[PDB]
Amino acid sequence: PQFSLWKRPVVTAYIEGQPVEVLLDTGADDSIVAGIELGNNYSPKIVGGIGGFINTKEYKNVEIEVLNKKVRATIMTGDTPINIFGRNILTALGMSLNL
């Protein structure tokens, strides 16, 4: 798969079996999804971006299926305008930015 960047590179991922549309983001170090409930075993974290920080709940070894791949990775949940898959998952999937 190859993504031109004319439109946002957004795909469907399944997090713990629930589908979420996510943005593939080389500018995000980690990943953060909204609207999913992952349970009580998390560590509190903060994440920053343009405009300030948000509180997040960090979850480890989450089961993800994306791009016909299956990984386990850390995901944060939080009030994010769009769901972001940062370089933590992208590296696990084997994606690169090419010119």
Ligand X SMILES: Cc1cccc(C)c1OCC(=O)N[C@@H](Cc1ccccc1)[C@H](O)CN1CC[C@@H](S(=O)(=O)c2ccncc2)C[C@H]1C(=O)NC(C)(C)C
Interface with ligand X (CB under 6 A): 25, 27-30, 32, 47-50, 80-82, 84, 86
Candidate ranges 20-28, 36-44, 57-65; the one touching its own copies (CB under 8 A): 20-28
How far are the Cα atoms of 14, 30, 64, 83, 92 from residue 17, in angstroms, in the given order?
Answer: 5, 20, 8, 16, 18
Number of CB atoms found within 10 A of residue 22's CB: 22
Q: Find the binder of its own copies among 20, 67, 71, 73 (CB under 8 A).
A: 67
What's the DSSP call for residue 94?
A: T
Rounded CA separation 40/50 (Å): 28
Nearer to its own copies, 8 or 72 (CB): 8
Q: Is 29 annotated as a binding residue?
A: no
Q: How far is the CB of 71 from its own copies (least distance, A)?
A: 12
Contact (CB, 8 A) for 75 and 33: yes
25 is known as an active-site residue:
yes
Q: Is 65 annotated as a binding residue?
A: yes
Q: Which residues are catalytic?
A: 25
